[PDB]
Design a binder for this molecule. Structure first.
Ligand SMILES: [Mg+2]
Ligand SMILES: [Mg+2]
Ligand SMILES: [Mg+2]
Ligand SMILES: [Mg+2]
Ligand SMILES: [Mg+2]
Ligand SMILES: [Mg+2]
Ligand SMILES: [Mg+2]
Ligand SMILES: [Mg+2]
Ligand SMILES: [Mg+2]
Ligand SMILES: [Mg+2]
Ligand SMILES: [Mg+2]
Ligand SMILES: [Mg+2]
Lengths: 247, 138, 199, 190, 109, 176
RNA sequence: GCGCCGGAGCCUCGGUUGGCCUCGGAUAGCCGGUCCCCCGCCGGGGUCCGGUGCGGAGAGCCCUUCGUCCCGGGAAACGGGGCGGCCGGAAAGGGGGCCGCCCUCUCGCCCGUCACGCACCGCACGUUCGUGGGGAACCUGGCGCUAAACCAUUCGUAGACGAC
RNA sequence: GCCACUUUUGGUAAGCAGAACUGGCGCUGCGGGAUGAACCGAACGCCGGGUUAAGGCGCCCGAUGCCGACGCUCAUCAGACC
RNA sequence: GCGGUGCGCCGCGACCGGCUCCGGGACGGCUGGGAAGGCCCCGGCGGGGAAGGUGGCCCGGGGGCCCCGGGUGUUACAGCC
């Protein structure tokens, strides 16, 4: 027999493998679609959730009851120290997808970013990129690692810069700096890469990524609440008091 | 557009069947897909024959659609079809097709020894011509 | 010892019915450019058939349900493994010798690829019937790489024409050299013409 | 029944230079060129006669469902000759009961904004077809003139702006408003 | 100094749909694809040649690893030039879709 | 009867057995179209049982012989009057064919009505076959071959002999 | 104690028995030229010339292996084989072309002349890709490498336990 | 006890109940009907060679990879074997 | 040397016989004492008929005398019955 009383189903099936996220850093599944008309700009940034507070502002929407009245609105502070760019990576469109092509790192990268390549920074001897950084200080390597920019300016469609947070400046216990590919959306691929190889091993602040009163998207992992029950997770109806094996 | 038309009096080479390899002449188109043919000078008897087996040459010889084999032979050897067929590039590349099938082992050896030198002489000429064109470019 | 089949203008199951048998007879088959496989019947019947195949998901776990491959090469792969006995290990060792490719990748772009006349649209459909492109069907049933593979194939065509112009040039140098050499290869040619190779 | 042969000649006039590249035709004359490939139609197009005065379409061994496509080819060639000699002027009139249909022409004949249709505030922006020039005719108060070479472009750009002006959820037999195709003639005459 | 055996693929056993008879091999000889062409190969010697681990003795030579199973072609099989053969020990199903060398030497020319 | 192969055309005569009522019966002749003389003699005692009060037991085949066609090198027109059974009802017909032999047109008639009407050979009866001169012909699918200047190409030569070259380089040509 | 570059063998897994180095594509139409002509950065198109049961043919092309010895003819000489530089590669990257050098050869290819090479005595898996893939231990040298992971401790943005 | 051709009773009808003739299944494998107590072929000691039946011969899958013959058929629900 | 018996293992060839599948030749019988067709503008001499009408004649168009349609008619510079 059917349901006597129809009712919409609990939960959404679009978010269905409700598992622990494999990543701690929120990952951008799709950067904004590129077009060669606009000037070059980063399209993502990282920040840290500080907390919540109020706002009072005067609203200007002609038609509401709250035009030229003043609401309060909850807001969230995200501390965003300027992120240090430490590499680029290119991507070639393939019939099987979009393959990475040639990752090129900077010369001097900081040892808060070097923490990321080590599961145990104490026991290690800090040997990462030591044989790689010596390519920047000889002509045998300089003509090697600018010939590949010349191949990235031929065969890559998507150039994504490779930045990292600067966790020296944060109040946290952690020092291992998160790092992120940020897609550079701008002119041709030559302009797009000869913009970022000067941003290589230097700062990028927030104010030349975003602006005021712009809508953005927040990527991140939720506050974990543990192994919880079906009425706590899926919000199904609590069975009545009289039930024998739990309600 | 089209160049070979099935009509009264076109010579047709025959692909397969019992009379494969013989020219024939269309007398009268019986149906959509079968036709009354004969070759009075190529040893193939007056009969019907479908269009699935006959390939059309560009030879028309003129005789009426009810004419008998006595008068088809006259318009055959008038136009002299049997020598014009052997002079065609068609029959030369069916005759050179069957010479390679007739080729024995000693003939296959002699052909191998001939082409082993003839390709080398051609290639030694071609790689003189290539650098001659390159010195012309230079 | 590796058979490279073209895929343009071949009927889907009519090509698969002989790819399956050459694969079972131990012959390593790589078919290529499965974009231009065309299916008979019109496009709307074929799209309705593939959407009906998309409707066939296992009710309790569609992840365990039938994997509806959207790429044209893997549509052709699944329609070969329908024809192969893929449960048995000879069918599994058969499917390991079929290698499908969307477009023509660089292992096989500079290799001469073969055409089956016995599975081909202009031979096995009468010309007033209307067929259906597997590339367009796979695209607007959810294969994401039509335009990418189309630009890469256009890049391959504008380079294969550079190859073919040089091949024409070499053949013209050859047939202009042969008249220069016909006085000294007059007796090397004559024994070829008497054995049916150069007339 | 397969008939053995159907054909139908088309007399091309003096000023028209017609040519045909295999099965794809090109008709040239005063106003321009029109090209329309018949690569679906499976016939024999032959440009017989020196001085090149007639096109002749042949169909060999055709049943009636594909013999129907002979005067179709002849009529597309005749509408292809007409749109290069004379052109295609479709005049179409805006019938309005109460609210005036305010048509303004933008992008020098390529875009039509239709306003105030039944007093609605949504404006119909309809793009024309490449080769068609819309205009508001003088010496007649509300009449649009669509002129061009291809009849399938002129008539389709007429039907687009005619189906852009429809009523919704009302008695169509009473709310008889909209732009409708009134006269189907040539641009210049003979 | 060259090759002296025709190429053949061991297609399967002589089989009905629900029954196979392992005392008769189906050989698909490369090049012949019709019964008017399979006339030459009747009664020819043929061999399934395979390597293994332990050394066998090779006639006319030192012990190798390569072993054989000999047999002869018996009769044609269907219109596509497929042919039947019988080997003196029945073929393992390992050999399905591998290369049986069909000899020339019981020659009838 | 099944219309096996090509049909042959038989002149079968027969009569009932002599009785003291009538010592010499009249002899009856039919054109029986049949794959062989055994089924020809069976169709004879089918039709003569439908016509006369005569059966195989009280009668005999006086002469069963294949009547050969008298001009098999002239293309001729044939009119065949017919009688067959549909899924519901019996229909009289008149079909026209164009062939070399009188029995070739009949074996074309059986394969045409099996094609078009799903009429099987036991259901089809055959009553008259006439050689018809080209003025008295009235079927448009036959009369279109009645011109002295007949002319047509063979436009779309579909490739037969497909699996003989099976894997080639060249695409097969179709225009010849 | 590891990676790379340049020797004898052993164990194991087995399959194979010459390569085809590529236009796009039409199919009621194609292929190859010529350019005398018209525009573009050599390419497109017209004209004309050839093919079109495809012969600039996958019914096809290339290579062809018994060896050496002399002497002659035909072919080569600009070629044959061996060291430094210029380019050709991204969809899953090209052991290809070119410029030099110090060497070297009238050798190779096609006809002939001359005789030799276990002629192993009629008999099977021979003939290759094969320096095959993998696995250990032996060899001698050259130039280079000296790491991370996991547990234990801690954290609490995570947590049934692991995991993070 | 059950099923099937044809004859047949009750019942709207039934993979229902009740008869007659004969053959089956049960007691019975095998080839075919994908699948299957009964249908089509065929009944069995253990094997080699040949050949068939019913049914098949794109591929699973032995066999049409015949240059098979003549037509009909377009289905945005095609059709496909007691 | 003869006769019997077998070879340690793996193989081959020859002829004879049985049982089968297939190929290549060759001859004869019958029928409507085969039916048709082949050879003697050509089976002969006279007679006839039309058409899926050859000449020719006329009209029309594509022309540079040829080709293509349409009409007439009965052997002509084709043939058929
Ligand atoms: Mg409900
Ligand atoms: Mg209780
Ligand atoms: Mg209302
Ligand atoms: Mg070996
Ligand atoms: Mg009962
Ligand atoms: Mg009961
Ligand atoms: Mg019993
Ligand atoms: Mg039984
Ligand atoms: Mg069933
Ligand atoms: Mg029965
Ligand atoms: Mg048996
Ligand atoms: Mg079956």
């Amino acid at each position: 027999s059917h349901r006597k009383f129809s009712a919409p189903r609990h939960g959404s099936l679009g978010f269905l493998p409700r598992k622990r996220s494999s990543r701690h850093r929120g990952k951008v599944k799709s950067f904004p679609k590129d077009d060669p008309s606009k000037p070059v700009h980063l399209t993502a940034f990282l920040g840290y959730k500080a907390g919540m507070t109020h706002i009072v502002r005067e609203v200007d929407r002609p038609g509401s009851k709250v035009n030229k009245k003043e609401v309060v609105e909850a807001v969230t502070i995200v501390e965003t120290p300027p992120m240090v760019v430490v590499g680029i990576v290119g991507y070639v469109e393939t019939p099987r997808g979009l393959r990475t092509f040639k990752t090129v790192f900077a010369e001097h990268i900081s040892d808060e970013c070097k923490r990321r390549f080590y599961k145990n920074w104490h026991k290690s001897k800090k040997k990462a990129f030591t044989k790689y950084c010596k390519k920047w200080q000889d002509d045998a390597g300089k003509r090697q690692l600018d010939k590949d920019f010349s191949s990235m300016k031929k065969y890559c469609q998507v150039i994504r810069v490779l930045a990292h947070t600067q966790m020296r400046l944060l109040p946290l216990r952690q020092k291992k700096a998160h790092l992120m590919e940020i897609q550079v959306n701008g002119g041709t691929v030559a302009e797009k890469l000869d913009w970022a190889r000067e941003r290589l091993e230097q700062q990028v602040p927030v104010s030349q990524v975003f602006g005021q009163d712009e809508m953005i998207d927040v990527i991140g992992v939720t506050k974990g609440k543990g192994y919880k029950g079906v009425t706590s997770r899926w919000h199904t109806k609590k069975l009545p008091r009289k039930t024998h094996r739990g309600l | 557009v089209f160049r070979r038309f099935v009509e009264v009096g076109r010579v047709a080479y025959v692909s397969f069947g019992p009379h494969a390899g013989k020219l024939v002449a269309i007398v009268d188109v019986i149906d959509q897909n079968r036709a009354l043919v004969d070759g009075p000078c190529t040893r193939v008897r007056r009969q019907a024959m479908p269009f699935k087996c006959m390939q059309l040459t560009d030879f028309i010889l003129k005789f009426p659609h009810s004419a008998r084999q006595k008068y088809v032979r006259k318009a055959w050897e008038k136009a002299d079809i049997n020598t014009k067929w052997a002079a065609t590039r068609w029959a030369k590349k069916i005759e050179a097709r069957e010479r390679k099938a007739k080729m024995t082992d000693f003939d296959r050896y002699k052909v191998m020894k001939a082409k082993k030198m003839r390709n080398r002489i051609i290639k030694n000429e071609v790689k003189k011509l290539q650098r001659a064109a390159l010195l012309k470019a230079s | 010892q590796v058979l490279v089949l073209d895929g343009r203008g071949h009927l889907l199951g009519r090509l698969a019915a002989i790819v399956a048998k050459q694969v079972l007879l131990g012959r390593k088959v790589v078919v290529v450019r499965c974009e231009g496989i065309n299916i008979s019947g019109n496009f709307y019947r074929n799209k309705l058939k593939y959407l009906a195949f998309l409707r066939k998901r296992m009710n309790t776990n569609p992840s365990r349900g039938p994997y509806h491959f959207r790429a044209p090469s893997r549509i052709f792969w699944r329609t070969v493994r329908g024809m192969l006995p893929h449960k048995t290990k000879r069918g599994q060792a058969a499917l390991d010798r079929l290698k499908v490719f969307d477009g023509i990748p660089p292992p096989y772009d500079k290799k001469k690829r073969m055409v089956v006349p016995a599975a081909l649209k202009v031979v096995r459909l009468k010309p007033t019937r209307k067929f259906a492109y597997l590339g367009r069907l796979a695209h607007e049933v959810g294969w994401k790489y039509q335009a990418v593979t189309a630009t890469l194939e256009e890049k391959r065509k504008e380079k294969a024409k550079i190859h073919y112009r040089k091949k024409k040039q070499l053949m013209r140098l050859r047939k202009q050299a042969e008249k220069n050499v016909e006085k000294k290869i007059s007796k090397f040619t004559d024994v070829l013409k008497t054995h049916g190779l150069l007339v | 029944m397969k008939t053995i042969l159907s054909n139908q000649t088309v007399d091309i006039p003096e000023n028209v230079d017609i040519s045909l590249k295999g099965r794809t035709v090109i008709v040239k004359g005063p106003r321009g060129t029109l090209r329309r490939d018949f690569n679906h139609i499976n016939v024999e197009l032959s440009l017989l006669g020196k001085k090149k005065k007639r096109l002749r379409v042949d169909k060999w061994w055709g049943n009636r469902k594909e013999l129907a496509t002979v005067r179709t080819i002849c009529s597309h060639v005749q509408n292809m000759i007409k749109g290069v000699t004379l052109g295609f002027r479709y005049k179409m009139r805006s019938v309005y009961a109460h609210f005036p249909i305010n048509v303004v022409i933008q992008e020098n004949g390529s875009l039509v904004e239709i306003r105030n249709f039944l007093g609605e505030k949504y404006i119909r922006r309809v793009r024309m077809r490449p080769g068609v020039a819309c205009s508001v005719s003088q010496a007649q108060k509300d009449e649009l003139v669509l002129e061009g070479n291809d009849i399938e472009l002129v008539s389709n750009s007429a039907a687009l702006i005619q189906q852009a002006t429809t009523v919704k959820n009302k008695d169509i037999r009473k709310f008889l408003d909209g732009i409708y195709v009134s006269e189907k003639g040539t641009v210049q005459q003979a | 100094s060259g090759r002296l055996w025709c190429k053949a693929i061991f297609a399967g056993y002589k089989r009905g749909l629900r029954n196979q008879r392992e005392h008769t091999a189906l050989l698909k000889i490369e090049g012949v694809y019709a019964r008017d062409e399979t006339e030459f190969y009747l009664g020819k010697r043929c061999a399934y040649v395979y390597k293994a681990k332990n050394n066998t003795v090779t006639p006319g030579g030192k012990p190798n690893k390569t072993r054989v199973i000999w047999g002869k072609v018996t009769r044609a099989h269907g219109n596509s030039g497929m042919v039947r053969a019988k080997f003196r020990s029945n073929l393992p199903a390992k050999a399905i879709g591998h290369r049986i060398r069909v000899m020339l030497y019981p020659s009838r020319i | 009867m099944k219309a096996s192969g090509t049909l042959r055309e038989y002149k079968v005569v027969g009569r009932c057995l002599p009785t003291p009522k009538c010592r010499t019966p009249p002899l009856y002749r039919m054109r029986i179209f049949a794959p062989n003389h055994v089924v020809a003699k069976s169709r004879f005692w089918y039709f003569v049982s439908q016509l006369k009060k005569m059966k195989k037991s009280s009668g005999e085949i006086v002469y069963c012989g294949q009547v050969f066609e008298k001009s098999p090198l002239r293309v001729k027109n044939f009119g065949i009057w017919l009688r067959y059974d549909s899924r519901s009802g019996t229909h009289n017909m008149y079909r026209e064919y164009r062939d070399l032999t009188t029995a070739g047109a009949v074996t074309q008639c059986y394969r045409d009505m099996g094609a078009r009407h799903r009429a099987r050979a036991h259901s089809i009866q055959i009553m008259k076959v006439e050689e018809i001169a080209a003025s008295k012909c009235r079927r448009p699918a036959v009369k279109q071959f009645h011109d002295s200047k007949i002319k047509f190409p063979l436009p779309h030569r579909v490739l037969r002999r497909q699996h003989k070259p099976r894997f080639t380089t060249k695409r097969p040509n179709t225009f010849f």
